[PDB]
Design a protein around this nucleic acid. Structure first.
Length: 40
DNA sequence: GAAGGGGGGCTATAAAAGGGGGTGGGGGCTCTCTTCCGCATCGC
């Protein structure tokens, strides 16, 4: 995966934008899904 | 037919006369925010 970084990312944070260049969502699994690849 | 020659008109100078014509001068690239339109929704 690729995520915007450096100056272009700094702009998105201070130029707060409705549509980021590379929106992302880090999801953490709660139950047995976290420790089981099949269940994940 | 080329070339030199001769005769005559053009040029300026003043001045008057009177009118036509010439001349010049007026006038009828990217990101963000805002606005408008179509739609579906309820309401009465």
């Amino acid at each position: 995966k690729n995520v915007t970084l450096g100056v272009p990312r700094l702009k998105e944070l201070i130029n707060i934008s409705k549509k980021p260049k590379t929106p992302s969502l880090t999801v953490f699994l709660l139950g047995q899904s976290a420790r089981d690849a099949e269940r994940a």
